[PDB]
Design a protein around this motif. Structure first.
Motif, short mmCIF file in Angstrom:
data_model
loop_
_atom_site.label_atom_id
_atom_site.label_comp_id
_atom_site.label_asym_id
_atom_site.label_seq_id
_atom_site.Cartn_x
_atom_site.Cartn_y
_atom_site.Cartn_z
N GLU B 4 0.82 -1.20 0.00
CA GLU B 4 0.00 0.00 0.00
C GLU B 4 0.86 1.26 0.00
N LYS B 5 2.00 1.20 0.69
CA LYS B 5 2.91 2.33 0.78
C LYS B 5 3.43 2.71 -0.60
N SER B 6 3.84 1.69 -1.34
CA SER B 6 4.35 1.87 -2.68
C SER B 6 3.24 2.45 -3.55
N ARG B 7 2.02 1.93 -3.39
CA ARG B 7 0.89 2.35 -4.22
C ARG B 7 0.54 3.82 -4.00
N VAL B 8 0.38 4.22 -2.74
CA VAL B 8 0.13 5.62 -2.41
C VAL B 8 1.27 6.51 -2.90
N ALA B 9 2.51 6.02 -2.78
CA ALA B 9 3.66 6.76 -3.29
C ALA B 9 3.53 7.03 -4.80
N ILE B 10 3.22 5.98 -5.56
CA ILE B 10 3.10 6.06 -7.02
C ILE B 10 1.97 7.00 -7.45
N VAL B 11 0.77 6.76 -6.93
CA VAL B 11 -0.36 7.65 -7.17
C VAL B 11 -0.06 9.12 -6.81
N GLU B 12 0.60 9.36 -5.68
CA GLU B 12 0.91 10.74 -5.29
C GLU B 12 1.92 11.38 -6.24
N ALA B 13 2.89 10.58 -6.69
CA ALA B 13 3.91 11.07 -7.62
C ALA B 13 3.28 11.36 -8.97
N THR B 14 2.31 10.54 -9.35
CA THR B 14 1.60 10.70 -10.61
C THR B 14 0.75 11.96 -10.57
N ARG B 15 0.10 12.19 -9.44
CA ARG B 15 -0.64 13.43 -9.28
C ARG B 15 0.31 14.62 -9.39
N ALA B 16 1.28 14.70 -8.48
CA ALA B 16 2.16 15.87 -8.46
C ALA B 16 2.82 16.13 -9.82
N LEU B 17 3.23 15.07 -10.51
CA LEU B 17 3.83 15.19 -11.84
C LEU B 17 2.85 15.68 -12.91
N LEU B 18 1.62 15.18 -12.86
CA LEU B 18 0.57 15.71 -13.73
C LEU B 18 0.42 17.20 -13.53
N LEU B 19 0.25 17.61 -12.28
CA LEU B 19 0.16 19.02 -11.90
C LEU B 19 1.33 19.89 -12.40
N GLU B 20 2.55 19.41 -12.22
CA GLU B 20 3.71 20.22 -12.55
C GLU B 20 4.07 20.24 -14.04
N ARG B 21 3.84 19.14 -14.74
CA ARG B 21 4.36 18.98 -16.10
C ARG B 21 3.30 18.66 -17.16
N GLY B 22 2.04 18.54 -16.74
CA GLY B 22 0.98 18.13 -17.64
C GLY B 22 1.14 16.67 -18.07
N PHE B 23 0.15 16.16 -18.80
CA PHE B 23 0.14 14.75 -19.20
C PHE B 23 1.28 14.38 -20.14
N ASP B 24 1.52 15.21 -21.15
CA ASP B 24 2.56 14.93 -22.14
C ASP B 24 3.94 14.87 -21.49
N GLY B 25 4.10 15.57 -20.37
CA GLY B 25 5.40 15.67 -19.72
C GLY B 25 5.63 14.65 -18.63
#
Lengths: 182, 181, 180, 179
Positions: B4-25
DNA sequence: TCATAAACGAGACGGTACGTCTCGTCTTGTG
DNA sequence: CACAAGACGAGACGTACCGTCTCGTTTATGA
């Protein structure tokens, strides 16, 4: 001294068009374009800053294949209804659809090309509408919210659903929206 | 089992990265690295980048999907809802979610199907239902909903931030008024 | 983690392309292709085309370096050693090796140092030691060695596989006679 | 147009000094001159051919006439010592390196450079020996051995190679030519 | 209470595409 | 009417990620 080769520009542009058609924006590589057009990559980079500017220039030269004239008559409802339906028909042909999709994709990815494509596509459509309503003396806030909903109906539907979206719904949306303006 | 730790980590990183760089990035390797995870543990549980992003959006769906108020004035209701939606799609987050929903759907068929199920279909449903709770003809409810949601979503996608609650509300009012005989 | 076999494949491929291209027309991409490998497998383990090529050259030292004969006739031994050397630089492979060694060395000093340490030095050491046997002034031994290796290496670098065993052996004979 | 052909050569020269061989580009040469690179390509296929012409026009900084006196050991020792000094000056080492690189880059160029450099050195030695009624095989082998010693050694070690070593190899080789 | 298998972090692998670079030929305007 | 200025086709450069596939190394019960 040396000057730009028209033959190469034409070949690049045409090859890009074809590749978008068979692959989509996400499926388009500068390398494939260069190959398909028998040119060198650098002939593409020399003239266009990115995939996005190239694609934008290619769609813009096809912009007439989407922008039909706005019909002018004593009957404004039937005019905007014909306009909406005609635009819908255009946006649900194979290339009309692929053109809209590509246009969206390229716009999402790069703001400059969103702006240029929008002065190429969005703005003239919306202005056809606002002009047509300004003929009937409609407060610009209203004519704006109206143009908003009429064009948005079509563009959003064709993006969510596909070519299945029929003229009729667009024409209906035109009628409702128009009747709302009393 | 599954971490679960890994999963929440991945989802959170995916969110923050979407926010900062958009989908293409957004790259998978980036997500993995920012999450402190090995990238295989992303491939193991998600079939593709698009599905992962989809999951992330759906998990965030409640930031955008607001329940249709049902009072006595259908106009004030639909306008309330439209302005609310336009306000929620107008923050950096709502906006990023919109652009991402679009990009991902344009690129992947089934991701489009999931996101349409999770976003577009219920939002069309809100307006449609609200009009069929009076007795507007079904074609007219479809087309009206088409037009309200169309106005809001295509406007936000065209002018981003400078779209306003006010134009969306006014648009609501015009559509509703076009439904009275 | 690191794949052997990928490595082996890259070293053999490099050998082939050098042999055919040679060093100046050696590209990483051709090597990658030839070895059925991703470029990045070459870039991960080698700081330059020169260090790659140098590993490939140093593994083939045996093809060139031969033991110094030790008999009662030092003239005979140096004639044999030199003729055996000049034979091995006159083959397709040995010649391509020398050109590559020299090309590689000219381009970067660490490479030139590694190759000079794996090639030039053991050979001049071989000669010098062989003469140190027969008891000769250090300067004389040195400048004799310079000329025994020099004759062969510079002949082969200039004219190519047209250079002969005979000439190398005779040069040896002359030099050693001259140490009398 | 042969006014251009000359303005290109000295431009290549000047550049080749400050950048060395590897850092030479036809583009840079065309830039120093008032010339489009196509003018350079009219007369040379490549960088190697042009560098080669520069070097050939400077053969005389490397080759020096063979002394001919009554003492062969002195003549050859003198020759080898002079060539040795010439090849380890500073500009001479750089020139030798450029010469070797330029040769390795293409076979045709290695042949023009061999024909204008290696060959006349070898033949100066063979001829000086033929003047003493030495066997052709032995004159060739002795030539290979002296030139070889000098050149190989300056290529292997730095500019630290010394006159006395070359000279000494000369005395040794010549001594070895005696019955 | 351990041993035991899954899930994991790390990251090397064969690959595709990137955007930059330099080569040698081809093109064109001006001097 | 020749030629500088430079666009062109070609293709290698070194980097970034892709999705697949080992590697030891945690862990979390259920034998």
């Amino acid at each position: 001294g040396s000057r730009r080769s028209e033959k190469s520009r034409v070949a690049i542009v045409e090859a890009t068009r074809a590749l978008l058609l068979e692959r989509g924006f996400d499926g388009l590589s500068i390398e494939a374009v260069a190959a398909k057009a028998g040119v060198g990559k650098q002939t593409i980079y020399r003239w266009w800053p990115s995939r996005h500017a190239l694609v934008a220039d290619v769609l813009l030269e096809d912009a007439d294949k989407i922008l039909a004239r706005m019909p002018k008559t004593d009957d404004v409802t039937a005019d905007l209804a014909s306009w909406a339906g005609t635009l819908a028909a255009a946006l649900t042909t194979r290339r009309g659809h692929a053109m809209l999709k590509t246009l969206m994709a390229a716009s999402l990815e790069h703001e400059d090309t969103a702006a240029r494509l929008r002065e190429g596509f969005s703005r003239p459509l919306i202005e056809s509408v606002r002009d047509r309503l300004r003929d009937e003396d409609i407060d610009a806030d209203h004519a704006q919210a109206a143009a908003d909903a009429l064009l948005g109906a079509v563009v959003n539907a064709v993006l969510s659903e596909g070519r299945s979206y029929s003229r009729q719904r667009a024409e209906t949306s035109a009628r409702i929206i128009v009747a709302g303006l009393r």
